[PDB]
Amino acid sequence: LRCQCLQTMAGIHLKNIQSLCVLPSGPHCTQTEVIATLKNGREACLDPEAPLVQKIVQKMLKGVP
Amino acid sequence: LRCQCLQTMAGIHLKNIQSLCVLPSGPHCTQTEVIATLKNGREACLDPEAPLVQKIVQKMLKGVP
Amino acid sequence: LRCQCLQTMAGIHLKNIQSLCVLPSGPHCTQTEVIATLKNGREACLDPEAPLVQKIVQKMLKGVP
Amino acid sequence: LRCQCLQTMAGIHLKNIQSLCVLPSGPHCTQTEVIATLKNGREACLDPEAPLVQKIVQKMLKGVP
Amino acid sequence: ELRCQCLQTMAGIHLKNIQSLCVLPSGPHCTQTEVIATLKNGREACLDPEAPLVQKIVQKMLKGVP
Amino acid sequence: LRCQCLQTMAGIHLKNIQSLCVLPSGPHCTQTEVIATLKNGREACLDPEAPLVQKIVQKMLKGVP
Amino acid sequence: LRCQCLQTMAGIHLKNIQSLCVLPSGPHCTQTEVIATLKNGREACLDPEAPLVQKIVQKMLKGVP
Amino acid sequence: LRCQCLQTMAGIHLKNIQSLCVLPSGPHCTQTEVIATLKNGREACLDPEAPLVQKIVQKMLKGVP
Amino acid sequence: LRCQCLQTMAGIHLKNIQSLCVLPSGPHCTQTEVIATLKNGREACLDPEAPLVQKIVQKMLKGV
Amino acid sequence: LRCQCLQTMAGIHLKNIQSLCVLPSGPHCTQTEVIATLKNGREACLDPEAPLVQKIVQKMLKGVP
Amino acid sequence: LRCQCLQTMAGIHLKNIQSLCVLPSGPHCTQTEVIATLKNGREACLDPEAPLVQKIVQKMLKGV
Amino acid sequence: LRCQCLQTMAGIHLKNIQSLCVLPSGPHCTQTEVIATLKNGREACLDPEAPLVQKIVQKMLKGV
Amino acid sequence: ANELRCQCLQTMAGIHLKNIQSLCVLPSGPHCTQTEVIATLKNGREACLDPEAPLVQKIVQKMLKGV
Amino acid sequence: ANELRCQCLQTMAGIHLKNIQSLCVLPSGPHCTQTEVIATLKNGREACLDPEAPLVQKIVQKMLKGV
Incomplete structure (x- = not known):
């Protein structure tokens, strides 16, 4: 039950995004983390x-778009 | 590869939301649909x-929240 | 036998990288593409x-490091 | 979780290389090891x-080339 | 009807690491003799x-x- | 992980040999054993x-020959 | 429907033989050929x-024996 | 791993025999048994x-013959 | 559509017989032939x- | 492994019979049953x-006849 | 396009009958023929x- | 293993009937159903x- | 096979609407003397x-x- | 392929009766949200x-x- 993201990256394009999940704070993680799944x-x-x-x-x- | 949501509901509380995924339009579905997973x-x-x-x-x- | 990467991202940290594979050009892809697998x-x-x-x-x- | 390479070899030609992965040091291995996959x-x-x-x-x- | 299994040769093989060594001679399958060593x-x-x-x-x- | 050869035979002709594998000693077998695959x-x-x-x-x- | 044996070998031990089939002459082969299956x-x-x-x-x- | 032959029969003609396998004694069977396959x-x-x-x-x- | 039996054998035991089919004469074969299937x-x-x-x-x- | 015949019928003519199999008693069936295959x-x-x-x-x- | 039944048999029991088809006369057959399929x-x-x-x-x- | 007929129809003429099968009751269907195949x-x-x-x-x- | 004759030898009745999955209407022409309707059930x-x-x-x- | 979706993406008009060789009417159900009619020309x-x-x-x- 640790955080799924070790770090953040950038340069994501909207056209390529198939799904975007927002996982907020709690016992599972110290901060809110967003995981985008591409096509x-x-x-x-x-x-x-x-x-x-x-x-x-x-x-x-x-x-x- | 059909739409996952048959309909929309309301009255969601932020405190209860464990995860919120946003699935946009494409071949899979006619419109954008949001799926919230509770705790x-x-x-x-x-x-x-x-x-x-x-x-x-x-x-x-x-x-x- | 298409290209594995739809796009490029940045902000990768060396400490997090568990493996880095370099896939050059050929019949499989138009350009060279690098795929880094995190820990x-x-x-x-x-x-x-x-x-x-x-x-x-x-x-x-x-x-x- | 041991090292994948028992030893090193040489005489690799670039034309034949389909993929080259670089696996650095860590708990998995004492030293950095490179694994090249041919065509x-x-x-x-x-x-x-x-x-x-x-x-x-x-x-x-x-x-x- | 098959092609040659080795695209090229490499060197620096150590005997201790060799688990098996197969020698595939010439024929319809390949132009020259080729040796394939499988490690442990x-x-x-x-x-x-x-x-x-x-x-x-x-x-x-x-x-x-050894 | 026992020895593959129960015994040895002789009278092998080189012309008929399609492949010859040499399996040395180890945990798998007490002695070195050679397995020749014909055409x-x-x-x-x-x-x-x-x-x-x-x-x-x-x-x-x-x-x- | 060609001959199953390309050549003959020798040094067979009776103890190791699990089965011995004798295939005589005919349209299938020019001469009689014996195939011994070990244990x-x-x-x-x-x-x-x-x-x-x-x-x-x-x-x-x-x-x- | 029982015996393949329940009983023996006789009156076999050599001309009709396409193959004759001899299966000796062991863990598989109490006695030696011969199985002849006709054309x-x-x-x-x-x-x-x-x-x-x-x-x-x-x-x-x-x-x- | 030839005869199924090339020859006859003997020494069959009743206890071992699981099925016994009797195929009579016709265009398929010159004579009547019996095929016994064991257990x-x-x-x-x-x-x-x-x-x-x-x-x-x-x-x-x-x-x- | 049940009985193949549910019932018996009569009025069979010899001329029409292409094959007649006699299946005796055993674990497979309580009584002996005869199956006649017509032309x-x-x-x-x-x-x-x-x-x-x-x-x-x-x-x-x-x-x- | 010949007749499916070479002959008639009797002693059929109703309980065992799963289906009963009645094929009348025509170019296919000289007379009406009934084919009963058991369970x-x-x-x-x-x-x-x-x-x-x-x-x-x-x-x-x-x-x- | 459901019933083959969803409903019944009428106005069938005998001349047109090539085959008529009668499928009785059982595990397969609640009631007896008749299926007529035309020429x-x-x-x-x-x-x-x-x-x-x-x-x-x-x-x-x-x-x- | 039988090319270009009428598909229906006769008419039947007692069709229920609930059971009808498709209903095709084939009019007159070289293919048939009269208009014929073919209903495919579910x-x-x-x-x-x-x-x-x-x-x-x-x-x-x-x-x-x-x- | 597309299994069990609607066959018509849209409707068109200006159909002439003389040209129609067959006209099938496919009603509503699990296969489609609304009734759709498919006319096959000669x-x-x-x-x-x-x-x-x-x-x-x-x-x-x-x-x-x-x-």
Whole structure:
């Protein structure tokens, strides 16, 4: 029951994102961590504090590029 | 490869949410659909257009329920 | 026999890298692509042209931080 | 969780290399070890200290002959 | 009808590590004789039959191991 | 992990040999044992001490009859 | 429907023989050929003309060593 | 791993025999048992003690009618 | 559509017989031929003219 | 491994019978059951106790109508 | 396109019948022929003229 | 192993019937069901209780 | 095989709307002397219908509006 | 392939009765959300139609009566 992300990466493109899960804080992890799954299947971690990540999340809800 | 949510429900509380995945449009589904997994394990579908759902998502990224 | 990486990401830390495979050009892919596997197990793609990536690769050969 | 390479071999040609993975030090192994997979499928171990191996790695990143 | 199993030859093989050494001669399958040595971990590695070390390694395996 | 050969046979002809594997001593077997696979597919065991067998092995390396 | 044995071998021991099949002449083969299956499972061809082979066959019928 | 023959039969003709296998004693069976396969495919058991059977076996080795 | 039995054998025991089929004459074969299948599975041909075979067949009908 | 015949029928003609199999008692069935296969291919069950059936069987052995 | 039944048999029991098909006359056959399939799977031919067969058919329609 | 007929239809003509199978009750179906196959090949379900169907069946047995 | 004749030898009746999975209407032409309707049920068994019949015409219009 | 989805992505119009070789009406169910009509022309090319449309309903009843 440790954190799934060791670190954060950046440069994620919205077109490639097949799914984006937001895992908040708790006994499982010290901080909130976001895991984005691409269309090929490879997962990639993201920063919830980052402005691009927050911009990407709200765009997925409204409508896709 | 059909849509996972048959319908949307409401009245979700942030404290109970263990994970929230956002599945956008594509060949798999006609519209964007959001699936929230609670701490007990039971999943529940949400509306991306809904104002509460959008408010819940941004709050999870920043900080605590 | 298509390319394994849809895109490149950045911000990789050397300490977290458990393995780094370099897949060159051929019938399988138009360009060279690098796939780094972290200690947790999650893979992440990298740019061979990038200066940090080239600096990370040579450091792994000589000796770890 | 022991080292995958018992020994090192030499005389590797760049044209034949389909993939080259660099596995650094850790709990898994005492030293850094490099595993090159050929186009036929047969794997072969390499020395990270060797000058040819270091020359082969940097050439794969830049471009193929 | 098969092609040759070895694309190239490598060297620096140690006798202690060799678990098995198969010698595949010429024929319809391949233009030249090719030797495939399987190590104790399981990883295979190709060898040169013309090489003096390889010929010295083969005869030593028959007589008795180091 | 017992010995593959129960006994040795003789009268092997070089022309018929498709492959000759030499399995040395270890935990798997008390003595070194040689297994020759013919062109039809039928395997046959050989004596490493035998002079003909040693003469056959060196001839395969140099060049075929 | 060709001959199963490319050649004959010798030095077979009766104790090791689990089964011995005698395949006579016909459209399938130019001459009579004998195939002995050992207890481990490995088959081995024999000469019907050979005196030891004929002595081995008659001994199996009467009673085993 | 029981005996393959429940009983013995007689009146076998050499011309009809396509194959004759001799299965000696062991853990598999209390006594030696002979199984003759005819040209049509139907198997038939034989007595190793019988004089005709022993005469049939030696004739197959030398040369067929 | 040739005859299934190349020859006849003898020494069949009733206890071992699991099934006994009688295939009469016709375009398929010049003469009547009997095929007995044992309990292990191995088939064996029999002579319909033979006295033991005729005695074995009638005994199977009445009782083992 | 139950009985193949649920019941017996009668009125079988010898001319139509292509094959007649007699399956005796055992673990497979409580009583002896006879299965007659006609020239068209359709099977039909018979009573071993019946006088016509016993008369039909003996006639097939001697010679056909 | 010949007749499926070479002959008729009798002694059919209603309890065992899983299906009963009635194939009338035509180019395919000179006369009407009835084919009854049992619960085990083995087919058996019947006479349409026979009184038992006609009695069996009407009983299947009404009730088992 | 469900019932083959979802419903019954009527207006079947005897001349068109190539085959008529009667499938009685059991584990396979709650009630008896009759399946008539026409000369063109198209199957059609029938009611065993119906008077015309019972009249059609007996007529096929006697003669076309 | 039989090429370009009428598919229905006769008409039947007593069709229920609930059971109908598909209903095809094949009009007149070189293929057939009269219009013929072929209804395919949910189990898969086809059944012919009369276009002149009042129930059949009532069934067709009901399928278009709603089940 | 696409198993058990709707066969028509959209509806078209301007169908002429003379060209129609066959007209199948596929109602609602697990296979599709709404009723959909597929008309096959004499050349072989299929074309989808609206069951709600007045021309389509007029075309269907005319095929039953006579061409």
